[PDB]
Design a protein around this nucleic acid. Sequence first.
DNA 1: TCGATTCAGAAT
DNA 2: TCGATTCAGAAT
Lengths: 213, 213, 165, 165
Amino acid sequence: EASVSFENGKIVVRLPITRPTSKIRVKKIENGVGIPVSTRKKSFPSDENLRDYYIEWQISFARDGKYDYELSRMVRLAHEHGILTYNDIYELLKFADDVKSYLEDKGIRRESTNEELYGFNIYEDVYPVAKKELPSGEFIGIVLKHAQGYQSMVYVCIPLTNVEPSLAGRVARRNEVVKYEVPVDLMKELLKAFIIASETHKNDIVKFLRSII
Amino acid sequence: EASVSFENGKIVVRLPITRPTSKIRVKKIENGVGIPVSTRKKSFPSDENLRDYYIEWQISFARDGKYDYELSRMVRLAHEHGILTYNDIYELLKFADDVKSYLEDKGIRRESTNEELYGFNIYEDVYPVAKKELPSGEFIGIVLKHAQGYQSMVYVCIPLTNVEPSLAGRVARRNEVVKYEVPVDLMKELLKAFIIASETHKNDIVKFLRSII
Amino acid sequence: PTSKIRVKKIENGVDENLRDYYIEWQISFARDGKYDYELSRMVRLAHEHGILTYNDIYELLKFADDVKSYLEDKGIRRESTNEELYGFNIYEDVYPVAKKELPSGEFIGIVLKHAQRAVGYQSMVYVCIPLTNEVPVDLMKELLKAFIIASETHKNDIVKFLRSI
Amino acid sequence: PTSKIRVKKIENGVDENLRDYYIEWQISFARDGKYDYELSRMVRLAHEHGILTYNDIYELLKFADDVKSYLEDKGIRRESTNEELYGFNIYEDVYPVAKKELPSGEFIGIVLKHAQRAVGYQSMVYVCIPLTNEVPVDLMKELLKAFIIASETHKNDIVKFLRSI
DNA sequence: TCGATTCAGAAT
DNA sequence: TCGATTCAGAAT
């Protein structure tokens, strides 16, 4: 699990970089796709291609029907130390009152083709995703999958240049976690992502934001 | 599980008599204690000692945080068919407002003794129970045990003479369940038992009774 | 944890917190009519290895000879109290337990329950071993005396086994 | 249910309801470098028993010879759409699947996933057997063709195995 | 082993 | 096997 804390007027979270099978994994893009990286055998580059490396974090809001987990822990600490203001939360709830279409409304569909593969029928499964680049460098993703109805999952991708210590020209350490100072806009954009992800997610954001106001 | 239904202006439940390891088991009292009975090998008596036979049913109110189970199913059907009236439910809630001491307040304690058993220290574990005889013949029991804090369990004991068919002078049949017409006073006394059992149980009775009013 | 051997910890009476963790063992004496299971195995194996001597069995046999009262004789009693809890009569069920601590830390408990399927009682022996703690010789001897003071049935079963070895 | 062999049922597309229940088998071709596991066992065992003839392997070898496109060539493509969902850009990920139903009821599916740990893709073959339905001969032959049309890696692995028997 | 998840399994 | 309950285990 990632450690959430507050130091020097910032919400920071500590992200492990040697658990590639967790919801927090280090990736590097090669020609537009993300490929996982063995952070203990391959030693990180000492150059500009380091920006192509990033941490992909499947961030959640709720756990066990409570809002004391990851994003809800970051938002509450941000609230308690005046990092997230009254108007910040007020604008979000007024944004939620205005949001009326959601990512899950796009659905998942299997499309028939005019293509055949040597006697095998060919189909195209079309899945919707939402992506947003922030000026600070991070990417926020929302992908839709089938409920194991639909369930929508929020991702945040953090460039390695945005965290300390600098891993440039070195290999990750054993059980190494990394310090990441969370910009306030990212916390707001993450709450926005959950608001527009689905109506179910939105009601959780709305119900949580109203409780701290 | 016992079947709950409504027939001819009565709430009736069907009680299985060949599941001696369930929460519904047939007992017979021998000198003041209840002893379980093999209803498929021993054939029931054809005489007056048949009253000494009874069905012991550990009755619950809630399941999975919902009130759609056993007593809550009997009370709701009784409500929907005018068997349990508005004033019936009103008197119960006014009874709950007046109840302020509970069975779990007696606690469980281990008492030291002046007795010794050949080098072994002797203790007495004292457990509280509540028992009530109704004019119709049934007994209602509340026993307190340790949470696997305390948890209190409600029992209702139904004489075999109060159910049909008459098992007098015969052995139970394979997978035989038995029809029992539930007197309205027993449903009220069962809700009373849960009200006084513990404050936790009372809040469930109060919260359920207020929802159907 | 659902076996007769399960690990628990003391919380509210029911680093240095490792002393609160112990293994509870619902230990048996016989199985399949013959006395070669759990306790009866320890006792015979120790008696064969010289760990238990000839004089050790006399003390147990003589001690068994002197025993008249048993834990099941106390029984479970439902005591009437003159209390009413909003029309409900209050009673107390008095279960008797015998406890004994050993210098090394292990506890031995004997508890009483209504005889299932039958009329009467059923007694059972437990040993609670701290996780900080192999079988001490004095442990085996107090376990036998545990079964000897539990009930006359268990005593006759223990006496019968000791005369064989 | 957590194995590669799990039972599911059709609900909303994803008595007579027993037709909706089927067994999903994530079936493999090779294991431990040698071709004697699951499918490769069925194929060799059937070829030895005369269930599969010499002419049956030519059809598969000739059919493999004629194959140029593979399911992994389609790849997974993230398509841009000109839509915005309150400041969030919407895209579509297009996963390609090949399906084939057999007259007895069984389905064969081949799905594509991003190559884990590596760059590229990883293809996998499934067989969905109705609970109302033993291995038909035509099943074994379409499973091979499933692996032959999945990827050139799987095709070269199938071609290499067929020339051995 | 960790990691993820939820079922089926052991227990008496 | 049912019955009761909740943990630990199998799965890859």
